[PDB]
Amino acid sequence: TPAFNKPKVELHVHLDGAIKPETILYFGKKRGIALPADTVEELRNIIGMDKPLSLPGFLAKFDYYMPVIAGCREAIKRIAYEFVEMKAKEGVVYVEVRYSPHLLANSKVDPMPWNQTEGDVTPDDVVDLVNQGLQEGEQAFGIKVRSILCCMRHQPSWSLEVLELCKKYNQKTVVAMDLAGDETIEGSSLFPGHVEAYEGAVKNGIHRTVHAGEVGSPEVVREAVDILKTERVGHGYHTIEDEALYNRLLKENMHFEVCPWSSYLTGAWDPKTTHAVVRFKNDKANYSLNTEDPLIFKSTLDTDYQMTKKDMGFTEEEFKRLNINAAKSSFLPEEEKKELLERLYREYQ
Ligand SMILES: OC[C@H]1O[C@@H](n2c[nH+]c3cncnc32)[C@H](O)[C@@H]1O
Ligand SMILES: [Zn+2]
């Protein structure tokens, strides 16, 4: 009994956080790289989370498997193809997948991630590989998929290259630029490289989204909106703490990419207090429901819908509403955006 057994739109999920324990296990053995466990079940209990951690603590779960995928063309392409398949099964008709091309390369990246040995999988090459896997999956499962390239908060030197990658692969799946990573790194939103990459995104027409306000204060969101110029805000739960900012973003119709389950598990939400999404629902705010990192939260898109249904009392009326806003707020060109909307209204009939 799915909470919302109808077509959905997902705007917030990381490719490297949506991998199958099985594929992780396959390449661990195939490359002879160690994993913390040798059974999908135990691998899933080590990588996955049962209780709230902190943002930096949760972020460490990637250390376990990223080395197994990074540097391998076959793996990079495969996880891209299998991602589409996963989303197809969840009943998602349009998705924007995000990831850091740098954390998957093993050549022309400094610092070299995961202590890898120089290879030939360049940051540009990883973008192309994901594109190919994404496209093959679209043909095979029939859903539309697009990508977003992430800037890492702690590594602003990578930022201008991410911008260049967005320019090159513009619409070749690539639709936007994101700022992901450790939100707690004081002043990370303001590092020159990040600011300059975003200034360039604005002048070159490249779409923008920024993780902000999951753990930081209203000010981090204010910097994302005012200085960085995001078109959307990843999370943004703390925005409501500044009635002025909240009400202003509400007026401009700012889109908040909400991830309920994630907010609880990253410690970002005290289950005693009313979840920010409730305020958004009541205020009729522009927001979407997202999974964020399904692998680590041992979850599915339905996890998040069920959660808002059971607690927070969401209805099908709201599920349809927020999905229309997600389609209106997607980074799809106008014509593709109309087609998506047409599709949903038909199926919501
Ligand atoms: O998907 C690109 C990167 O975004 C970071 N990321 C994943 N989930 C996140 C939640 N919040 C902030 N950053 C996150 C990860 O370090 C992953 O390597
Ligand atoms: Zn995220």
mmCIF file of all heavy atoms in Angstrom, residues 242-259:
data_model
loop_
_atom_site.group_PDB
_atom_site.id
_atom_site.type_symbol
_atom_site.label_atom_id
_atom_site.label_comp_id
_atom_site.label_asym_id
_atom_site.label_seq_id
_atom_site.Cartn_x
_atom_site.Cartn_y
_atom_site.Cartn_z
ATOM 1 N N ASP A 242 13.439 32.833 10.830
ATOM 2 C CA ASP A 242 13.591 34.244 10.492
ATOM 3 C C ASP A 242 12.329 34.581 9.707
ATOM 4 O O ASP A 242 12.321 34.497 8.474
ATOM 5 C CB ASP A 242 14.814 34.388 9.597
ATOM 6 C CG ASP A 242 15.248 35.810 9.416
ATOM 7 O OD1 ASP A 242 14.430 36.656 9.011
ATOM 8 O OD2 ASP A 242 16.443 36.078 9.639
ATOM 9 N N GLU A 243 11.248 34.889 10.423
ATOM 10 C CA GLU A 243 9.955 35.197 9.802
ATOM 11 C C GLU A 243 10.057 36.144 8.629
ATOM 12 O O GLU A 243 9.362 35.989 7.629
ATOM 13 C CB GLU A 243 8.972 35.743 10.836
ATOM 14 C CG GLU A 243 8.589 34.730 11.930
ATOM 15 C CD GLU A 243 7.752 33.554 11.412
ATOM 16 O OE1 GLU A 243 6.888 33.764 10.522
ATOM 17 O OE2 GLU A 243 7.943 32.414 11.911
ATOM 18 N N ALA A 244 10.972 37.094 8.724
ATOM 19 C CA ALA A 244 11.169 38.056 7.652
ATOM 20 C C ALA A 244 11.638 37.362 6.367
ATOM 21 O O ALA A 244 11.030 37.524 5.308
ATOM 22 C CB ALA A 244 12.187 39.087 8.084
ATOM 23 N N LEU A 245 12.729 36.600 6.474
ATOM 24 C CA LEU A 245 13.314 35.863 5.354
ATOM 25 C C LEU A 245 12.317 34.834 4.824
ATOM 26 O O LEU A 245 12.039 34.780 3.628
ATOM 27 C CB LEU A 245 14.609 35.170 5.817
ATOM 28 C CG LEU A 245 15.375 34.240 4.882
ATOM 29 C CD1 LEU A 245 15.949 34.983 3.701
ATOM 30 C CD2 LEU A 245 16.471 33.618 5.659
ATOM 31 N N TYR A 246 11.735 34.066 5.732
ATOM 32 C CA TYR A 246 10.778 33.042 5.365
ATOM 33 C C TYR A 246 9.651 33.650 4.567
ATOM 34 O O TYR A 246 9.364 33.207 3.453
ATOM 35 C CB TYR A 246 10.220 32.348 6.605
ATOM 36 C CG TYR A 246 9.126 31.370 6.294
ATOM 37 C CD1 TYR A 246 9.352 30.303 5.461
ATOM 38 C CD2 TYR A 246 7.852 31.528 6.819
ATOM 39 C CE1 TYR A 246 8.337 29.409 5.147
ATOM 40 C CE2 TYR A 246 6.830 30.633 6.510
ATOM 41 C CZ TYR A 246 7.087 29.580 5.675
ATOM 42 O OH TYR A 246 6.116 28.665 5.380
ATOM 43 N N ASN A 247 9.051 34.709 5.095
ATOM 44 C CA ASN A 247 7.949 35.328 4.388
ATOM 45 C C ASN A 247 8.348 35.929 3.056
ATOM 46 O O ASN A 247 7.572 35.921 2.111
ATOM 47 C CB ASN A 247 7.188 36.310 5.283
ATOM 48 C CG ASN A 247 6.200 35.589 6.226
ATOM 49 O OD1 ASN A 247 6.415 35.513 7.445
ATOM 50 N ND2 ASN A 247 5.125 35.028 5.649
ATOM 51 N N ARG A 248 9.589 36.354 2.935
ATOM 52 C CA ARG A 248 10.044 36.934 1.686
ATOM 53 C C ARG A 248 10.297 35.852 0.635
ATOM 54 O O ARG A 248 10.017 36.037 -0.554
ATOM 55 C CB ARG A 248 11.306 37.730 1.947
ATOM 56 C CG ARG A 248 12.069 38.104 0.731
ATOM 57 C CD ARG A 248 13.364 38.714 1.176
ATOM 58 N NE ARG A 248 14.335 38.594 0.107
ATOM 59 C CZ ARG A 248 15.620 38.311 0.286
ATOM 60 N NH1 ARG A 248 16.115 38.099 1.502
ATOM 61 N NH2 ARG A 248 16.408 38.221 -0.765
ATOM 62 N N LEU A 249 10.849 34.726 1.068
ATOM 63 C CA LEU A 249 11.118 33.633 0.146
ATOM 64 C C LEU A 249 9.769 33.065 -0.285
ATOM 65 O O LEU A 249 9.591 32.672 -1.428
ATOM 66 C CB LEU A 249 11.991 32.573 0.819
ATOM 67 C CG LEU A 249 13.494 32.690 0.581
ATOM 68 C CD1 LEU A 249 13.928 34.127 0.592
ATOM 69 C CD2 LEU A 249 14.234 31.895 1.613
ATOM 70 N N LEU A 250 8.798 33.113 0.619
ATOM 71 C CA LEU A 250 7.443 32.632 0.353
ATOM 72 C C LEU A 250 6.795 33.483 -0.738
ATOM 73 O O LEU A 250 6.092 32.969 -1.608
ATOM 74 C CB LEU A 250 6.616 32.708 1.635
ATOM 75 C CG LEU A 250 5.581 31.623 1.896
ATOM 76 C CD1 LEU A 250 6.209 30.249 1.708
ATOM 77 C CD2 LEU A 250 5.053 31.807 3.311
ATOM 78 N N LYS A 251 7.052 34.787 -0.689
ATOM 79 C CA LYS A 251 6.521 35.725 -1.670
ATOM 80 C C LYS A 251 7.166 35.501 -3.047
ATOM 81 O O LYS A 251 6.468 35.466 -4.060
ATOM 82 C CB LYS A 251 6.686 37.177 -1.159
ATOM 83 C CG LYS A 251 7.143 38.244 -2.194
ATOM 84 C CD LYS A 251 8.649 38.612 -2.027
ATOM 85 C CE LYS A 251 9.197 39.522 -3.146
ATOM 86 N NZ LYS A 251 10.694 39.686 -3.079
ATOM 87 N N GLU A 252 8.482 35.290 -3.073
ATOM 88 C CA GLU A 252 9.204 35.054 -4.323
ATOM 89 C C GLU A 252 8.957 33.652 -4.866
ATOM 90 O O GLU A 252 9.415 33.316 -5.956
ATOM 91 C CB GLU A 252 10.693 35.249 -4.107
ATOM 92 C CG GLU A 252 11.016 36.579 -3.495
ATOM 93 C CD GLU A 252 12.493 36.816 -3.291
ATOM 94 O OE1 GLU A 252 13.307 35.907 -3.571
ATOM 95 O OE2 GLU A 252 12.830 37.938 -2.843
ATOM 96 N N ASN A 253 8.234 32.844 -4.089
ATOM 97 C CA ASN A 253 7.892 31.463 -4.422
ATOM 98 C C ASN A 253 9.081 30.504 -4.473
ATOM 99 O O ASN A 253 9.107 29.545 -5.241
ATOM 100 C CB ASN A 253 7.082 31.392 -5.710
ATOM 101 C CG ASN A 253 5.827 30.577 -5.539
ATOM 102 O OD1 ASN A 253 5.690 29.499 -6.107
ATOM 103 N ND2 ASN A 253 4.897 31.085 -4.731
ATOM 104 N N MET A 254 10.065 30.769 -3.625
ATOM 105 C CA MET A 254 11.246 29.939 -3.542
ATOM 106 C C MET A 254 10.844 28.479 -3.313
ATOM 107 O O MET A 254 9.963 28.177 -2.497
ATOM 108 C CB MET A 254 12.138 30.406 -2.392
ATOM 109 C CG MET A 254 13.404 29.594 -2.231
ATOM 110 S SD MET A 254 14.445 29.793 -3.642
ATOM 111 C CE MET A 254 14.603 31.562 -3.580
ATOM 112 N N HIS A 255 11.502 27.594 -4.052
ATOM 113 C CA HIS A 255 11.255 26.177 -3.952
ATOM 114 C C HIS A 255 12.166 25.548 -2.910
ATOM 115 O O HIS A 255 13.364 25.749 -2.962
ATOM 116 C CB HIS A 255 11.508 25.508 -5.294
ATOM 117 C CG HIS A 255 11.132 24.060 -5.309
ATOM 118 N ND1 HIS A 255 9.832 23.636 -5.488
ATOM 119 C CD2 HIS A 255 11.862 22.943 -5.080
ATOM 120 C CE1 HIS A 255 9.774 22.323 -5.354
ATOM 121 N NE2 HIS A 255 10.994 21.878 -5.107
ATOM 122 N N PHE A 256 11.603 24.822 -1.952
ATOM 123 C CA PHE A 256 12.397 24.133 -0.948
ATOM 124 C C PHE A 256 12.405 22.642 -1.253
ATOM 125 O O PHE A 256 11.348 22.012 -1.256
ATOM 126 C CB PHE A 256 11.802 24.335 0.440
ATOM 127 C CG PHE A 256 11.789 25.764 0.885
ATOM 128 C CD1 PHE A 256 10.684 26.575 0.640
ATOM 129 C CD2 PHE A 256 12.887 26.313 1.532
ATOM 130 C CE1 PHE A 256 10.678 27.901 1.034
ATOM 131 C CE2 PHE A 256 12.881 27.646 1.930
ATOM 132 C CZ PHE A 256 11.779 28.433 1.677
ATOM 133 N N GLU A 257 13.579 22.080 -1.521
ATOM 134 C CA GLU A 257 13.700 20.647 -1.796
ATOM 135 C C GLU A 257 13.746 19.931 -0.434
ATOM 136 O O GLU A 257 14.806 19.811 0.186
ATOM 137 C CB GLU A 257 14.985 20.359 -2.591
ATOM 138 C CG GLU A 257 15.121 21.096 -3.927
ATOM 139 C CD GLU A 257 16.561 21.154 -4.445
ATOM 140 O OE1 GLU A 257 17.471 20.667 -3.772
ATOM 141 O OE2 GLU A 257 16.813 21.700 -5.540
ATOM 142 N N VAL A 258 12.590 19.463 0.025
ATOM 143 C CA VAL A 258 12.465 18.812 1.320
ATOM 144 C C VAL A 258 12.772 17.324 1.273
ATOM 145 O O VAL A 258 12.436 16.646 0.307
ATOM 146 C CB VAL A 258 11.044 19.052 1.900
ATOM 147 C CG1 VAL A 258 10.816 18.262 3.183
ATOM 148 C CG2 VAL A 258 10.855 20.511 2.176
ATOM 149 N N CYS A 259 13.427 16.833 2.323
ATOM 150 C CA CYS A 259 13.787 15.420 2.460
ATOM 151 C C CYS A 259 13.434 15.074 3.910
ATOM 152 O O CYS A 259 14.286 15.107 4.786
ATOM 153 C CB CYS A 259 15.284 15.260 2.232
ATOM 154 S SG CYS A 259 15.943 16.179 0.808
#
